[PDB]
């Protein structure tokens, strides 16, 4: 059963087990068993995205249709993670982004209003929402806040970067704790990346993974280069889509992997639920707008 | 001494294939990436070699899945879509648009050079330095292609040599009083012009004609717009390995996107695809036999490790 | 906007649509979450559109939908409501007995009165806008109406009296905006501009009053005020509500300001939205409900 | 004497066009309600004649425009959104749901029907004299067009007419017998059961096993399917014209949400449509012919008008 009627705010679509081709000049979708049932309804305009996933394939006549159309095409894996590959963006963000960043106060600006936003989700998600709470993430509501409401206060008063990232460290520490605890988990230390191999990092490192595709793909449509972060440092590979992953990690990976964990799910259990709960908190749509806003910003 | 990551950008700079396709389906077989086409009952099956590739040109009457993208864009392949015959695949407003390209997404690129290049492009008159020096290097593979390549002269490259060297002369000189991209430009054209004429002469052509947009009907024309597809998809890899997008041009970009393809691909056409275009068509070959002896000649030339090396060069020289 | 408390959603220029397992709704490029639980009503109104895909799950999540004007009046087509938190059983509960709907009739007034003295007098939107009230002749009116209407002993007599307060404050209404002589034209038949924007501004307020009933699934034949046999009839006496207090001010605001229909028209939807009329109209129909048992 | 209100139900009755749609858009062009089917280069346009339609049905693959909701809406035309292949459009625990139905809500409705309706509705035994009025109908409905309508006897419904008649005196004796709704849901499906078996002997289908929820994939079943949104289409138009909600069921209340409109369409299911699900199945009829020969034949037999006055009858029985 759905639960959300989604305000639509980027306009990408997402495509499975169909093929994209060409009828008498009009780019059609079909299945095994004729016509698909519902892709047709894709507005075919300059403003649209179109993703390619599970199951897809594309003639040469389609691609020339959509690139005439302005539409920008890409291919991802199942539930639009990760994105494997994409049409270059026509270069507005990218004016705008390079316009700030190499001002590292600009920077830093940036910076604290991600943090200001990542807090903003993991208040929203684990308290005011009630998804997370419903499914057995009983945590310290109190504990919870005052989390908040120190590491808030805590990055405030960072003077650069460095200490920025010293205190966006601290916090997430302590929400691995809180998370633990409020599943029962027992133990839990942070291993780097890779190198654990308890369920719980196991899901953390799957997690990152899959909103690691989500922030390429807001990145992607907003012409904006992985390689101009505002948090990571300026030679770290990919280091804006880690920025950007930032922003839903705490919020919806953390809680779902130590919950997954305390079920017993398998991967793709994991996985799963890890999809649905980007798309039902429109963590793409977030990624975006925060990426937007900051752009706007600036100057 | 050399990082890791440096090491794989000089490998990926060593793979040799390069495909052309038309009417067949690239899709994953046996976990495989394959193409295959429709012989009536037959159907033949093609392999790609996929950490050999550089790219896949994929025109009329193609299809590519999922999977294939998938394993393509996790090797490091680029994956353009282009026209049929050598025209655009398609022209709105007055641009013509020769590929549309799919780029890896999820193989994390390096930061250095796109910071360098965001770093001067925004400023116009070093996009004018930036483009002069894609012009310098552009001229100095002419000189030593036309006039040191000992393959090419034994191949039937029969071309006059002291009037290659002064039209090459001019054309510096021209090159370094440029006072903006019009003037480039302009330079660039009335170098091409001279060359195909003195090509046509080396090869027996008789008298020539260059026909845009693909319209050409004859073995040279048609040589030339197929090869700079493989140009294409060379400068596309370059610019795509260093992670420079292909949108931030330094000299066509008021008349293509993706415009630093362009900019990067004129580092070889005039060298080393023009000449091959009247080889070819001098000794009668089909397309794909042109298309072959290209991939040969780029390989042997290095063609795109010059690409790597003259963008990194262009990237620094803005420090 | 959607902008009913956390139950009743309305859309425009957009398409609703199922992408990637979502039901979504897509706004042109020319223009908030909305909850899909059974609780939801959702309406759609200018420039809309809906698939079968989706239709089939805000069906299946039992969110009831329409299609309506701009604004959200009048409403065109719905889902039935599933009989039943069921004021259909109440309703009928207390219809048939007469004495017990006149206790319904006599609340509507009640609630009436209250909603003409809210906005006449103590809010100060329209008289902002210069319906400039003789403030004690309309409490005057009111406090007459309501001991009268209490007065009372039958649908008739309250009827009559209901009009006789209509009437006198159409008087005040056109005093209060110096638009000098003015006689309520019955049925359509008037052509001075108060009397058209009164027509136009009632049916916006039927549109309204028609959401309420189907909110709360309650079918039109069943009225407390108007007659028996008088088609659309609990919808009428639904709007009757806020016509008064609303509709009537603004209708000879839009003839002194020299409006056309459809500044006439943004007026009412604005008032509408602003008091919210609405709300007002289903908490009142959910009282009479509850106090008929 | 006859009113402009009546007069206009009776126009109201005589609507002969039901559209079944799937994979168009319906909307709006040039002032009229089309939809429209893309077809590679050219798109096709087909007019819908709002004054002479009772309803959309739109299945797998339809849209459709508020601007059309208006103009139907206004010609009280009514739009039923269902599922794709004869199957539900969902199913919420045990109740399957077949057509969500999108009913207009400015067109008045007379006021009589409504209060008889909800002036016996509440009262269970009231609700079962009722049901067993729509049981009796429906027998004289299979009655005539089984035994008495020679035009399905020319098309080739080759019926054993006096096993017919035999079933159906059986199914009045257990009807009038019925203690319960329970009984009476008991002995409908009886009659039923025996209906799809002597309809596969007049024409021919072999052994013949009723599939449930859509799942049947030979074609009398897929018939069977498909021409009960015909029946539920011409029900919920004929409880909407008289102002009775859907839901006020007086026999299918228990399985079926909007549950009248099932009670209703029962009055023509097995008379009607289950004939010519066979006939059709026999000559090889697609879809699309199986749905135009059941349109006429329900014009031809007057059927919205049926329903229309047995609602009447039951609602001014109930008032005594
Ligand atoms: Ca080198
Ligand atoms: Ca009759
Ligand atoms: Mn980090
Ligand atoms: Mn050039
Ligand atoms: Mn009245
Ligand atoms: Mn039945
Ligand atoms: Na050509
Ligand atoms: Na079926």
Same mark, same amino acid.
């Given at each position: 059963?759905?639960?959300?009627?989604?305000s639509?705010?980027a306009?990408?679509? &997402?495509? *499975?087990?169909?093929?994209?081709?060409?009828?008498?000049?009009?780019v059609? &979708?079909?299945?095994?068993?004729?016509?698909?049932?519902?892709?047709?309804?894709i507005?075919?305009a300059n403003?649209?995205?179109?993703?390619? =996933?599970?199951?897809?394939?594309?003639?040469?006549?389609?691609?020339?249709?959509?690139?005439?159309?302005?539409?920008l095409?890409?291919?991802?894996?199942?539930?639009?993670?990760?994105?494997?590959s994409?049409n270059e963006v026509?270069?507005?963000?990218?004016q705008?982004?390079?316009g700030?960043?190499?001002?590292?106060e600009?920077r830093?600006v940036?910076?604290?209003?991600? *943090?200001?936003?990542r807090?903003?989700?993991?208040?929203?998600?684990?308290?005011?929402?009630?998804?997370?709470?419903?499914?057995?993430?009983?945590?310290?509501?109190?504990?919870?806040?005052?989390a908040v409401?120190?590491?808030?206060?805590?990055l405030?008063?960072?003077?650069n970067?460095?200490?920025?990232?010293?205190?966006?460290?601290?916090?997430?520490?302590?929400?691995?704790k809180?998370?633990?605890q409020?599943?029962?988990?027992?133990?839990?230390?942070?291993?780097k990346?890779?190198? =654990?191999?308890?369920?719980?990092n196991r899901?953390?490192?799957?997690?990152? &993974?899959?909103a690691?595709?989500?922030?390429?793909?807001a990145?992607?449509?907003? =012409?904006?280069?992985h390689?101009?972060?505002?948090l990571?440092?300026?030679?770290?590979?990919g280091?804006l889509?880690f920025?950007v992953?930032d922003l839903?990690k705490?919020?919806?990976?953390?809680?779902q992997?130590f919950?997954?964990?305390?079920?017993?799910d398998?991967? *793709?259990?994991?996985?799963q639920?890890?999809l649905?709960?980007?798309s039902?908190?429109?963590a793409?749509?977030?990624?975006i707008?925060?990426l937007?806003?900051?752009?706007?910003?600036?100057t």
């Amino acid at each position: 059963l759905k639960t959300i009627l989604h305000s639509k705010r980027a306009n990408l679509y &997402y495509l *499975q087990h169909c093929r994209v081709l060409v009828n008498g000049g009009r780019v059609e &979708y079909v299945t095994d068993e004729g016509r698909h049932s519902h892709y047709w309804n894709i507005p075919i305009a300059n403003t649209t995205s179109l993703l390619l =996933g599970t199951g897809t394939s594309i003639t040469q006549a389609a691609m020339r249709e959509l690139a005439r159309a302005g539409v920008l095409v890409g291919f991802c894996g199942g539930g639009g993670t990760p994105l494997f590959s994409a049409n270059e963006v026509d270069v507005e963000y990218l004016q705008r982004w390079v316009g700030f960043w190499f001002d590292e106060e600009k920077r830093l600006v940036a910076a604290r209003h991600f *943090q200001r936003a990542r807090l903003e989700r993991i208040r929203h998600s684990w308290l005011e929402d009630r998804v997370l709470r419903d499914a057995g993430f009983a945590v310290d509501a109190t504990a919870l806040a005052v989390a908040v409401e120190d590491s808030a206060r805590a990055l405030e008063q960072a003077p650069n970067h460095e200490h920025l990232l010293t205190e966006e460290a601290r916090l997430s520490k302590r929400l691995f704790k809180l998370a633990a605890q409020a599943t029962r988990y027992g133990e839990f230390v942070r291993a780097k990346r890779g190198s =654990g191999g308890d369920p719980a990092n196991r899901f953390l490192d799957h997690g990152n &993974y899959l909103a690691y595709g989500l922030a390429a793909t807001a990145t992607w449509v907003l =012409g904006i280069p992985h390689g101009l972060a505002v948090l990571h440092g300026k030679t770290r590979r990919g280091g804006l889509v880690f920025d950007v992953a930032d922003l839903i990690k705490d919020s919806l990976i953390l809680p779902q992997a130590f919950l997954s964990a305390m079920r017993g799910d398998e991967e *793709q259990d994991f996985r799963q639920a890890c999809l649905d709960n980007l798309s039902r908190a429109q963590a793409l749509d977030f990624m975006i707008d925060t990426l937007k806003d900051v752009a706007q910003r600036s100057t």
